[PDB]
Symmetry: D3
């Protein structure tokens, strides 16, 4: 029952993809600050979107048993859903390897969300990262998965 | 709109503390796997708890405008709330500095949550991380704060 | 002779600051691409500016004998000098320590320049990072130098 | 202009190579100290050459949109051009991948140059890193390229 | 001069390596270990995870080491009470152009260092007696064992 | 508890700390022979290892889970060949001004320098052994001086 990096040595390298999303719940004082350009640290969404891409590459360094893999693609979307006072984040990671990139996609979303928080923290300490969840995955033995 | 790493050279040095929490909602399959020791990768809670502490230390590397700071204390708790079918993660970070440690606490919880996910991913890809939020903080200009 | 991280343990801690700059020479093709918004990878200046801030924090990990130290302030500016077909980067770093932060400022500028190259090389592989040089530094026994 | 790590998933993996160079212009005092063995921190060229190799491997961590890839070869040369009062750095990186390694070669040279600066700034803060540029690349769709 | 040996034209093949390391304990460190540590947590559990993490960080620690995609990592940290010794074993696997001996060695060395960190409050004299390779396979030179 | 934690030292004073460790690499005849020739073609083993040690001291917090990250104020590493003994000796002294010791930084510096010696010579002999990584001295902290 001890920790281990699962042996995937005898698995073929195949096209892999994963998509996840996360949301940041906005207060009124954070929504208005966001529309005016932030709290003085710069564009919250721009900094968070790039932070997501970087995070995807740093996933193996953050998740102990995660496999170090070469990434062939990373897309990150950070948008304001004004009607919901919510910030939606989506990330898709791709690779050609023996194991999936769900952690990379999830991590990109979680860190981008953490960055939105960092960029609006001044206006509202109570902002909440609500859900971080997988939306899609394809490539491995189990094939395609849809939320 | 340009990103900036807020200058804190001209700022009061005080004792700082921040506490955050996060949750991972489990499916029946994941709960069962958890109670049996995991999916074969090791104890989900033990590995996630350690991941949280490591993440606290890597915060400045993940959050673009976060200040690199010496951390004097990090406590992380990852617990199974059986009846609620969810795992609760709590993290408290302390330091003596010119800037707060809310991001270290938030990041610790987010990465611990992501690790719980990685450790149970095989049972259910649909597990959800949510409610990553700050619970307490003190030492800043804004003073004491509690959810 | 033998490499060493200079012993500065018994040196008094003082305010430290350093400013450096760097330039990236552009071709007409790269300039044109820049004004249209990039080559398809995104805004070259925006990405490079953040890369610079991040690079300042990673300095000690890149320069072998550099002293690791908490930074209290990081400012990075990336500007397009159109008629000159040049991108200028400037960075100022601050802290309170026993050694200077010249490297952090130099590194921030260099990596930002490297990122500008990455964001535009698809247009022209021959782009050149012309210079990376110090402009100012203060602190320590021996302060106050300016080019 | 939204940032993105270009999708190269379906591109075939091929042998890639890239070579770049950089220079550090010296002052009389830097040159003198360099010839004496440094400023007391150690041999500037030796530490810089090793720093360049390490830098190549850290390229993806420094350049936001760069693809993390497995490097299969890294050569770095750091030499003093006494007459020109200049230090020349050259680096050739290789890999088996879907994208080129121009960034790794450029980064290796830039960081090696930064390290030379670090190893001699105690003698002269005015040293200048100049001409970080690509000299050659090959292996991809575009084919061969060389600075003429 | 230093170089990352060019293995671009070498074929990708299954490669594996196993190494081990020991940490000699004092009576006081053993006593502390048996009681759950010095207050920082379970020494063996933290050390075992540190070893896996170390395997992944090998290329960043060993200058001329090649960065490669690891396919498997196993680490075991056991207390040999009577001997007053903690034994660490690690096996790394991959499909690459170069071996993973460094990954296995580094995993054992860092796990041992972590055992030291987790118990040094009880005794500063703890010793990492040795780190050595036990087996490797997959390369041009094929199989090797101590 | 028995659960991991980065010990709370927030209220402790920031004092001058120092630590010295050593490590050895036992050589085979082939490795010893390779060393005297300048290595196995990857470069000077002792030179690369010495730098690796300094770099390792700085990466200690990133390698040891519960170690406190702190600003190092000094790092010295020596890697020497003890011919008659058929082995390489490594010693490292680390310094800082903090609330916790640097025994880990000194121990890690020696361990990684040793691993690097192995990497730089394993082509000659895979049976090289890293023996005795141990602390020799440390001062600062409530416990005071301590010497092997």
């Amino acid at each position: 029952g001890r920790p281990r990096m699962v042996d995937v040595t005898e698995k073929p390298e195949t096209f892999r993809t994963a998509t996840a999303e996360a949301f940041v719940e906005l207060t009124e004082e954070a929504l208005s600050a966001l529309e005016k350009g932030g709290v003085g640290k710069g564009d919250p969404l721009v900094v968070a979107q790039l932070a997501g891409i970087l995070a995807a590459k740093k996933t193996a360094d953050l998740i102990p048993l995660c496999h170090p893999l070469p990434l062939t693609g990373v897309e990150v979307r950070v948008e304001l859903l004004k009607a919901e006072k919510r910030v939606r984040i989506e990330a898709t990671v791709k690779t050609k390897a023996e194991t999936g990139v769900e952690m990379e996609a999830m991590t990109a979303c979680a860190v981008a969300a953490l960055t939105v928080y960092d960029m609006l923290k001044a206006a509202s300490k109570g902002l909440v990262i609500s859900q971080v969840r997988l939306l899609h995955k394809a490539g491995g033995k189990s094939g395609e998965w849809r939320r």
